[PDB]
Design a protein around this ligand. Structure first.
Ligand code: Y01
Ligand code: Y01
Ligand code: Y01
Ligand code: Y01
Ligand code: Y01
Ligand code: A1AIA
Lengths: 87, 48
C-alpha cells in the first residue's frame, strides 16, 4: 500500500497533473457560469451559482496568497512584483 | 492528378492546420460574444 500511496502522491504533485487539474476545473467552472447567466435566477442563487461564487472567492483568496508568498519582503514590493503579470 | 491542381489540393490540406487554430481563437471570441448577448437580452429563460 506504501508504493501505491507513493505513486498517488508523486502523480498528484506533478506540475502537468496540477495544470490539467486546474484546467479541467476551469472548464467545468466556465460551463457553470454559462448556465447561471443563460437561465433565469430567482431571489436567492441556485446551486450552480453558489459553486461559481465559491470558485470566485477561493480564487481571490488564492491571488491574495500569491501576493503574500512572493519573492520580496515589503508589501508594496510584493504587489509591484505581482502586477508585472498582467493576467 | 493534374500537375497544378494536385499541389493546390495538398496546399489546402496544409493550411487546414492554421485554419483550425484560427477556428479555435474565433470560437473563444464567438462564444464570449454570443453568451454575453443572449444572457443580456434574454433574462427570463427556462432551461432549453
Ligand atoms: C471536466 C470538464 C471537461 C467537464 C465538467 C463539467 C460538466 C460535467 C458539468 C458542467 C455544467 C454541468 C451542467 C449544468 C447544469 C445542469 C442542469 C441541471 O438541471 C437542473 O438543475 C434542473 C433539473 C434537475 O434538477 O435535474 C442538471 C445538471 C446539469 C445538466 C449539469 C450537468 C453537469 C455539467 C455538464
Ligand atoms: C468543481 C467544479 C468547478 C466542476 C465539477 C463539476 C461537477 C462536480 C458539478 C458541476 C455541475 C453540478 C450539478 C449541477 C446541478 C445539480 C442539480 C441538483 O439537483 C437537485 O439538487 C434537485 C433538488 C433541488 O432542486 O434542490 C443535484 C446536483 C447537480 C446534479 C450538480 C452535481 C455536481 C455537478 C455535476
Ligand atoms: C458542403 C459543405 C459541408 C462543405 C464541405 C467542407 C469540407 C467537408 C471540405 C471542404 C474542403 C475540403 C478539404 C480540401 C482539401 C484537402 C486536402 C486533401 O488532403 C490531401 O491531399 C492529403 C495531404 C495533405 O493533407 O496535405 C483532402 C483533405 C482536405 C483537407 C479536404 C477535407 C474536407 C474539406 C475541408
Ligand atoms: C467558430 C466557428 C469557426 C465555428 C462555430 C460555428 C458552428 C459550430 C455553429 C454556427 C451555426 C450553428 C448551427 C445553427 C443552427 C442550427 C440548427 C439547429 O436545429 C434546430 O434548431 C432545429 C430546427 C428549428 O428549430 O428551426 C441545430 C443546430 C445548428 C445546426 C447549429 C449547429 C452549430 C453551428 C454550425
Ligand atoms: C469552455 C466552453 C467551451 C464552455 C461552453 C459550455 C456551454 C456551451 C454549455 C455547458 C453547460 C450547458 C448547459 C447544460 C444544461 C442545460 C440544460 C438543458 O435542459 C434541457 O435539456 C431540458 C431538461 C428537460 O426538460 O428534460 C438545456 C441545455 C443546457 C442549458 C446547456 C446549454 C449549453 C451549456 C451552457
Ligand atoms: C482562474 C484560472 C487559473 C488558472 C487555471 C489553469 C491555468 C492557468 C491559470 C486557476 O484556475 N487557478 C490558478 N490561476 C488561475 O488564474
Amino acid at each position: 500500500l506504501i508504493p501505491l500511496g507513493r505513486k498517488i502522491y508523486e502523480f498528484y504533485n506533478a506540475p502537468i497533473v496540477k495544470f490539467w487539474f486546474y484546467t479541467l476545473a476551469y472548464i467545468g467552472y466556465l460551463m457553470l457560469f454559462n448556465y447561471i447567466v443563460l437561465v433565469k435566477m430567482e431571489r436567492w442563487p441556485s446551486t450552480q451559482e453558489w459553486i461559481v461564487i465559491s470558485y470566485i472567492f477561493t480564487l481571490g483568496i488564492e491571488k491574495m496568497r500569491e501576493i503574500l508568498m512572493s519573492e520580496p519582503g515589503k508589501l508594496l514590493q510584493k504587489v509591484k512584483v505581482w502586477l508585472q503579470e498582467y493576467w | 492528378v493534374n500537375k497544378y491542381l494536385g499541389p493546390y489540393v495538398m496546399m489546402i490540406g496544409k493550411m487546414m492546420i492554421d485554419m483550425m487554430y484560427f477556428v479555435i481563437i474565433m470560437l473563444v471570441v464567438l462564444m464570449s460574444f454570443g453568451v454575453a448577448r443572449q444572457a443580456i437580452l434574454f433574462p427570463n429563460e427556462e432551461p432549453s
